[PDB]
Amino acid sequence: MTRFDVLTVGNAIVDIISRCNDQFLIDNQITKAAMNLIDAERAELLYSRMGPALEASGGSAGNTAAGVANLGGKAAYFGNVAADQLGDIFTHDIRAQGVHYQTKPKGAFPPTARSMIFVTEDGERSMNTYLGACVELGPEDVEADVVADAKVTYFEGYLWDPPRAKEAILDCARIAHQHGREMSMTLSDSFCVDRYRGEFLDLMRSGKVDIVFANRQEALSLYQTDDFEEALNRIAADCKIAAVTMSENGAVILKGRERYYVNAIRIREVVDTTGAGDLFASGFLYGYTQGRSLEDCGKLGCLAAGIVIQQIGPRPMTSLSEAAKQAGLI
Amino acid sequence: MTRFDVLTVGNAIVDIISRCNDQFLIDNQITKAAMNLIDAERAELLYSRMGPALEASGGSAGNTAAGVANLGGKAAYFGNVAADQLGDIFTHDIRAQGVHYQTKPKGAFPPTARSMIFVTEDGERSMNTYLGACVELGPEDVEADVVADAKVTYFEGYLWDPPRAKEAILDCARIAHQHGREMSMTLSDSFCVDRYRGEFLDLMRSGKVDIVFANRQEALSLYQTDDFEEALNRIAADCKIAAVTMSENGAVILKGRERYYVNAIRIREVVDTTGAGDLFASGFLYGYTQGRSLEDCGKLGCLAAGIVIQQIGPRPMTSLSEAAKQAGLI
Numbered sequence A, B: 001m002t003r004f005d006v007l008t009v010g011n012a013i014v015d016i017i018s019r020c021n022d023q024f025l026i027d028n029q030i031t032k033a034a035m036n037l038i039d040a041e042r043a044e045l046l047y048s049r050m051g052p053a054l055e056a057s058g059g060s061a062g063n064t065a066a067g068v069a070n071l072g073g074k075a076a077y078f079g080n081v082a083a084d085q086l087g088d089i090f091t092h093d094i095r096a097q098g099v100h101y102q103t104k105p106k107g108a109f110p111p112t113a114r115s116m117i118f119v120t121e122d123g124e125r126s127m128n129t130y131l132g133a134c135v136e137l138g139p140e141d142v143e144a145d146v147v148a149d150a151k152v153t154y155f156e157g158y159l160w161d162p163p164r165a166k167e168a169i170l171d172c173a174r175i176a177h178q179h180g181r182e183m184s185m186t187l188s189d190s191f192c193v194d195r196y197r198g199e200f201l202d203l204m205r206s207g208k209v210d211i212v213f214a215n216r217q218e219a220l221s222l223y224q225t226d227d228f229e230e231a232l233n234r235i236a237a238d239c240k241i242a243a244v245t246m247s248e249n250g251a252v253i254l255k256g257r258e259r260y261y262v263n264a265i266r267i268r269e270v271v272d273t274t275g276a277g278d279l280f281a282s283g284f285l286y287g288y289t290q291g292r293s294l295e296d297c298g299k300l301g302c303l304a305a306g307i308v309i310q311q312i313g314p315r316p317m318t319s320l321s322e323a324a325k326q327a328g329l330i
């Protein structure tokens, strides 16, 4: 009996969401489909140009934890907010979903991280993130008992941007593996991969990470190739299990020489791709920690991801457990 | 030419929105379909029981102002927030829509008003509102030049709950009428009417209010009758123009002995009724200040209301002017 199926660790962020036309991205030099890091001044400037918006709790790993809880798994989260209204919102939403969240704010400045996410007509999302209080996440925020009691500890590639978060993750890896648990990461973003390519490969090759999540763009970036088949062969050689998503083309799960291809679900419309990779990870890890086959893990992931992209906001507002039952997956 | 078509005045509120089951309202003694006023302690309690939520700028008059601007009219707004993150969200969203909004916060405490809005499976909304900084709105917040330069000044019945807002409205009425402008009010909520019945009737009978908006429930409450036909006859006798909404049954506009019935638009599915009345007022007032017939004002009102109820959140995220053009209302 273990307390948690999945612990996730990431940048605790509230999303500020608006729809824009494609010229808006060009005029403001926002890299489309990417996570664009911004300072406080740029955040104010961008906000001043943004239309009326919606707010929703975000953070890649936060979304993944919420998804696992939604499906019926037991989840926990480490991430740092400020003692402010945005932080109170973040804390409420993740705990309300049934995720264990106990990371204490350190003060009111820097303020809670926020990401201005612009959704274009094609449903693509372009994020503009001020890290704020996320820069204060460190080893002191590792709840050692929680890591020890979680089947899988999953973390964001994005954690390599703030200065001390990587130290916390190294502590997590040691505790997890001392207790026979598994470590997982997502490559997060192709530009994130570009920034930390050598470090990410070292995490995988040293065995600090057991299960890796990537999309097509991240996998291509990791090996700096345009050959997707090369990327798949290389990622399989670098980690024990790789789960590679391919948008409308579904996903492929690799283990050694094993490959399991899974189809994307049928969708009404792509409203907002925000959270797709996050929720794929939720589905996958839920299945993984329930002892499901790798293909069925992929199927659960594709289900969760296809659901999230048909709504505004990064965390499904409907029951994923009910959808899984109806899809005949649980 | 006047600077503004519509000035609105109301409680500046950020909405915190979640879906709930029918049992949740009963268990928490929340009056369904109503605005339930709550103190700080109850706000904390209710939030602790609320699921993961979405935040969006609200406030009945705020929504109406935003709707006028969306349609292409020139709008302004008076309402008091705190110097906090919620207040900064509110200020951003209304100004981003192109509404003139210059009410300065008086400090961080009390904090910005928020309303926990619970949406049931039928799409009905039940609001639970902590007024916070709204209690500070007073005569000092009247921008006299704006009232003087606005074709219509419209305000909430809800303004009778905070202590000094009514004094601001009486100042508005004097300035508006001295400058040959018109005053309008919404009855807001049937329990609000029950609280201020005598005062609302006096506003109308004294001629401080020229145009009144009501739904069926509010009209029935105003005259404490269950005879809707009596309520229509009475409201017509009490104000120069009455616009009375009847949910799926459309609307009726009254002027003296004239009655103009308008059909509601036919809906796929009612997602969330939040903002329906507010946006009916936006369409009506936009039409009115453009010199349109009372029937066409009612038509524009129903168009805007039908749009807002098919989305989560109180302010339409799509173009109302484009919708009106397609409808030949222009």
Ligand SMILES: Nc1ncnc2c1ncn2[C@@H]1O[C@H](CO)[C@@H](O)[C@H]1O
Residues within 6 Å of the ligand: A010, A011, A013, A014, A015, A035, A057, A058, A059, A060, A061, A063, A115, A127, A129, A156, A158, A159, A274, A275, A276, A277, A278, A314
């Ligand atoms: N730098 C970042 N680190 C972690 N998550 C982020 C970052 N920027 C944006 N996000 C989150 O990514 C989510 C979608 O994958 C959004 O909900 C958003 O909050």
Ligand SMILES: Nc1ncnc2c1ncn2[C@@H]1O[C@H](CO)[C@@H](O)[C@H]1O
Residues within 6 Å of the ligand: B010, B011, B013, B014, B015, B035, B057, B058, B059, B060, B061, B063, B115, B127, B129, B156, B158, B159, B274, B275, B276, B277, B278, B314
């Ligand atoms: N007491 C109140 N005064 C004014 N507006 C309110 C009040 N309570 C809730 N609202 C707003 O009513 C809107 C729906 O008509 C919501 O957007 C909500 O913000």
Ligand SMILES: [Br-]
Residues within 6 Å of the ligand: A084, A085, A086, B084, B085, B086
């Ligand atoms: Br704050």
Ligand SMILES: [K+]
Residues within 6 Å of the ligand: A272, A273, A274, A275, A308, A309, A310, A311, A312, A313, A314, A315
């Ligand atoms: K989404």
Ligand SMILES: [K+]
Residues within 6 Å of the ligand: B272, B273, B274, B275, B308, B309, B310, B311, B312, B313, B314, B315
């Ligand atoms: K709505």
